[PDB]
């Protein structure tokens, strides 16, 4: 029953999907990062002159 906790967990990735697939009996694939990107937007404001 926490909002900020879920907001921070949403950035950890889709590990829950892999956990569910492993629990159902489907093996986890071992590959590179073709779905998760470490991108950034740099929303920092400009300093006043």
């Amino acid at each position: 029953d926490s909002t900020e906790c879920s907001n921070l967990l949403l950035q950890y990735g889709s590990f829950c999907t892999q956990l569910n697939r492993a629990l159902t009996g489907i093996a986890v694939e071992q590959d590179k990062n073709t779905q998760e990107v470490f991108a950034q937007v740099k929303q920092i404001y400009k300093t006043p002159p």
Binding site: Q40, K42, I44, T47
Partner: protein, 49 residues
């Protein structure tokens, strides 16, 4: 005599104001550099997290 004393006082005040402006500019430059470094460190920490 009074005019000479007043002129000397005004000259001393002008020199003190010039020194104050120089020291103020130096301190403001230092504070701006500190703030820039702090913002850079904040951005780095946010990206790392």
């Amino acid at each position: 005599s009074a005019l000479g004393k007043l002129q000397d006082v005004v000259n001393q005040n002008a020199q003190a104001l010039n020194t104050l402006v120089k020291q103020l500019s130096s301190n403001f430059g230092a504070i701006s550099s500190v703030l820039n470094d702090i913002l850079s460190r904040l951005d780095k920490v946010e990206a790392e997290v």
